[PDB]
Design a protein around this ligand. Structure first.
Ligand SMILES: CC(C)[C@H](C(=O)O)[C@@H](O)C(=O)O
Ligand SMILES: CC(C)[C@H](C(=O)O)[C@@H](O)C(=O)O
Ligand SMILES: [Mg+2]
Ligand SMILES: [Mg+2]
Lengths: 364, 364
């Protein structure tokens, strides 16, 4: 029957881009006869202002009652001076990921046709193009390991975090990465620091174990330091990157920046039962909120991922995805996607969402 | 009296580039009337072949008897299939750094005049140039924290590593970074993951404490994921990056790759008494060993750093550095520094070292 979405738009540009994603979703809902109901909940900075913490109990409960979380972006200068355990980004995201066992983080990143010049890559390298999916383990590793904290005082005061992974944790995220590569260019690059870390040694070992179920998929391993170098020089040679929590954090950001168009990039954080959290790869960008300049595509595509992965509405997802393609090849680009020559052709946040929603309605 | 250097050339191109560094050192020794004696010791792959382990007791002892270690590069496909605790790179480097308390790792990286086109950066970004020194803590953090290892079996088997830092450890590496920035463009960017890690929270706090002694130096903090993005887009805006062990590992490699000329990059790993290990930033590059194509500059400049930091021979260090500059502006470039148009002008490893040594002798 009726799917239920918890909408957690957050701070900065979160609400202005979410409006567009909802618009585009309305068009898909009409097209494909989907019954989806949405409820908005405060999260992040806005929840601190309205409820005193970044993840109110009522927001968490709302997410428990939902089929998926359509998440915008959290954080801003207003809350930057809070203590770490009170700050809105970590305080929204990590407890959500932990509470819903969102172990799989998917961050697809491609260099889009006609947007090479925005890539910080040398032109010959951007011309080759790339499509790299980062598959990052999201509920384990050093993010959530214990013990975590500090002891002592003065010069001998120490703080500590424990990177821990079990075989089961590694194998479930590896399987996602292999399955994904099977649908793509059949290569998994597993990123670790096996020359230094015991966690990484187990990582590498278990990824090799999972590989036996995927004779069709090429496995290679790379150190995270070396990986930062290779993505810069030859990102065309990667297909799926499979990473631990901290290493995928790092690499997914690098890869996103290499596109030159982070406003296009969405992500999915999924548990094993199909519930997930779908959010743009980029931040709350408070510098631009309320001006109608923010690119809503990453939010719109977060809604497409939501449809695909949580709602099992692949047609609807793909329709959104095609409508975004159509915008990008029909002169509907926000200002950050354009060179200075061309920046006067910039579309506003509402123009973009209107275009995209209209493309969905028109049968793209 | 006579300085004593332990020379640990290692594997792959290590020995062919070390020969040049020794050549250039001989010229400096003659110029500045330095009395330096050197003894070669096996390390890495060659030590596994000759002694059964990557860091023989006699090599470690040789290093104990020395004023500094002039280190080449370790590792190669021959040893790649060994267990992690037997492999030559980690097995040479980490016990050296730990045994000599080499807490400070310095990796200067600049985009050289006339070599912008080799940078994987977009041309307008490479044209702006950059000079970024990574100051990385080298003896602490997750590299050496305990507990480290694994427990259990089967799906519930777990491995673990503990990221730990005390105030004392953070403050000593922070001081290096501030002192270095005071000599440069007066900015320290401290890189952490304070939104997630307790270790990072202490990092950030203590770096802010150290800052009070440096009113002249601008401090800013950045998350390691965000840092990977910003170095790509605007590396001209960084001066000194100050990083924990794992975060500096990652970032220093990224920054080195952004130069496009890793064969030029040297590094210094120093304890608080002035003993250190000086090594190129790039690996053993077995693909090219024995062919006389390897760029010896990074090794030559490792010898310059050795002179400066361990031997207190600043004039000699700078002479080497000027002789390398002279090579690079006098058409003495190895093939990897040249575009395909120009690659037939490539100099061999010996030609480069002969040039550089001759420039030192000639009074550059
Ligand atoms: C905000 C922070 C806790 C988070 C993370 O580290 O996972 C963010 O960088 C991310 O990539 O979603
Ligand atoms: C070989 C490895 C243990 C080492 C490190 O991780 O420190 C290397 O990557 C480095 O940058 O010197
Ligand atoms: Mg991140
Ligand atoms: Mg490294």
């Amino acid at each position: 029957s009726s799917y239920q979405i918890a909408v957690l738009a957050g701070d900065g540009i979160g609400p202005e881009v979410m409006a567009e994603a909802r618009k585009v979703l309305k068009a898909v809902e009409a097209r494909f006869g989907l019954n989806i109901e949405y409820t908005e909940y405060d999260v992040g900075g806005i929840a601190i202002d309205n409820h005193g913490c970044p993840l109110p109990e009522a927001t968490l409960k709302g997410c428990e009652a939902a089929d998926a979380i359509l998440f915008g972006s959290v954080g801003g200068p207003k809350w930057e001076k809070l203590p770490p355990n009170e700050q809105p980004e970590r305080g929204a995201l990590l407890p959500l990921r932990g509470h819903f066992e969102l172990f799989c983080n998917l961050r697809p990143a491609k260099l889009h046709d006609g947007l090479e010049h925005m890539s910080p890559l040398r032109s010959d390298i951007s011309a080759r193009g790339f499509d790299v999916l980062c598959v990052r383990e999201l509920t384990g590793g050093i993010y959530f390991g214990k013990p975590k904290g500090r002891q002592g005082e003065g010069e001998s005061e120490e703080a500590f975090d424990t990177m821990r992974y079990s075989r089961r944790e590694i194998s479930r995220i590896a399987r996602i990465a292999f399955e994904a590569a099977r649908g793509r260019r059949k290569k998994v690059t597993s990123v670790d620091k096996a020359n230094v870390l015991a966690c990484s040694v187990l990582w590498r070992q278990v990824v090799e174990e999972v590989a036996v179920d995927f004779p069709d998929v090429e496995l290679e391993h790379i150190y995270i330091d070396n990986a930062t170098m290779q993505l810069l020089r030859r990102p065309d040679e990667f297909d799926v990157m499979l990473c631990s929590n901290l290493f995928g954090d790092i690499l997914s950001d690098e890869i996103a920046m290499l596109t030159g168009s982070m406003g296009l990039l969405a992500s999915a954080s999924m548990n094993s039962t199909g519930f997930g959290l779908f959010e743009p790869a980029g931040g709350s960008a408070p510098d631009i909120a309320g001006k109608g300049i923010a690119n809503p595509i990453a939010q719109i595509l977060s809604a497409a991922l939501m449809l695909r992965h949580s709602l099992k509405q692949e047609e609807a997802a793909s329709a959104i995805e095609r409508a975004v393609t159509k915008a990008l090849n029909s002169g509907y680009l926000t200002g950050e996607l354009l060179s200075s020559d061309q920046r006067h052709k910039a579309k506003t946040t509402v123009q973009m969402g209107d275009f995209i929603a209209d493309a969905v309605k028109a049968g793209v």
